[model samples]
Target: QGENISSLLRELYAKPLSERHVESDGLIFDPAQITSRTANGVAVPHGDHYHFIPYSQLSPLEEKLARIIPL
Candidate 1:
């Protein structure tokens, strides 16, 4: 299942950024960065397989989806 910006933003604003931009397996998940885009659902290819984060989990806002897309 894809993660929504709602949860991420909630943690982002409430918690410290020390773990905000945490990286794993060459992938950057959540946290604040630059750039943006929109999509029906953003996807990432994983070594194990693949996973998707549908826009449905999101607010349906441009900037919201954009940041997740990470162009």
Candidate 2:
């Protein structure tokens, strides 16, 4: 699932960035980047897929899911 602002903020504060960004498989993601939008979808013709379900949407009884590793 996705993270909330607090979680996003904590994530930003948790890491020390190098070069202000990290690139993988032609995609550039900023460690400090956090958006209020919920990311929930599947990509077509896909190799790698991404989903960001807000923490608020997560069920309290559900176990937390970890980050996805692209193949």
Candidate 3:
């Protein structure tokens, strides 16, 4: 009676990255690209140059949707 979660995730990923997540401080961020964390709580990678931002900087909506996606 319900759709598979994988399909939902695929649909989300199919959408433009812009519609899937919000930018912070003029930079694009991907929740899935987070490889490791720093002592300062940096979440995702940047420009392949080792830049990062605090998880708190992510859009509230993005964080909320991520939590709900698994549930």
Per-candidate Cα lDDT values, in order, are 0.45, 0.33, 0.52
- Off-target runs (Cα >4 Å) in candidate 1 are 1-38, 59-69
The residue-by-residue lDDT of candidate 1 on 1-71, one tens digit each, is 14566565665556554443223454543424332323555554556754454545433342353355334
Maximum-lDDT candidate: 3
User: What TM-score would each prediction reach against the true structure?
Assistant: 0.32, 0.21, 0.40
Total colliding residue pairs, candidate 1? 2
Model with the higher TM-score, candidate 2 or 3: 3
Instruction: Report the number of clashing residue pairs per model.
Output: 2, 1, 0
Candidate no. 2 TM-score: 0.21
- Model 3 pairs in collision: none
Q: What is the lDDT of residue 26 in candidate 1?
A: 47
Ranking by TM-score: 3, 1, 2
Q: Could you report the Cα RMSD, in angstroms, for every candidate shown? A: 9.5, 11.1, 5.7
* Number of the top TM-score candidate: 3
Supply candidate 2's per-residue lDDT for 10.
Answer: 57
Tens-digit lDDT track of model 2 for 1-71: 23464475455445565422233443333322223232441122213554343334333211022122121
